[PDB]
Structure 1
Amino acid sequence: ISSLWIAKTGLDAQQTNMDVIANNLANVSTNGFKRQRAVFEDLLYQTIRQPGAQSSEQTTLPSGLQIGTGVRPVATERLHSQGNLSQTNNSKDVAIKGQGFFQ
């Protein structure tokens, strides 16, 4: 049944989003960490009956059937913003102002 196979994808998408949120919350106190946001994107649609035009001035609704398929997680993008600075007073701690990475 298509309904089960669609709701399964919905539940999986929600589960992955919850995992992303949990990972973001878990290491909140780590230094130099950038949050993540997961973006979803719907799957392709199947057209069963082509919406044949009428143009008969009957003001009738379009008669076309198009079934969806479900949802998938497409990407997880991290926001590279400048976080706050916390002072450790240690002589060997360096904080970057702007953009760049150590190698």
Structure 2
Amino acid sequence: GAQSSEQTTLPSGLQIGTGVRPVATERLHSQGNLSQTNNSKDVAIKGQGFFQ
């Protein structure tokens, strides 16, 4: 964008870039398929809650 001449501008100048970095590791909080273990004590959640 710098003025290359008195009446013109420089389009898309010289950008030399460095490498790549990892930003973040995100989890996919979705509903997994249910498995029945025939146990009176095992509980499964259907929506978007957590046990405390």
Normalising by structure 2, we get a TM-score of 0.74
User: Greater CA deviation, 78-87 or 53-62?
Assistant: 53-62
Give distance in 1, aligned partners of 2:12 and 2:44.
62
The runs of at least 4 consecutive aligned structure 1 residues that moved more than 6 Å come to 54-61
Structure 2: 5+ residue stretches without partners: none
Q: Computing the radius of gyration over CA atoms, which structure comes out larger, 1 or 2?
A: 2
Greater strand fraction, Structure 1 or Structure 2: 1
Q: CA RMSD in A?
A: 3.1
**How far 1:64 moved relative to its partner?**
2.1
**CA distance in structure 1 between the partners assigned to 2:16 and 2:51 by the alignment:** 50
Identity of aligned residues (%): 100
For 1:78 and 1:63, the matched residues in 2 are separated by: 37
Shift of 1:62: 3.7
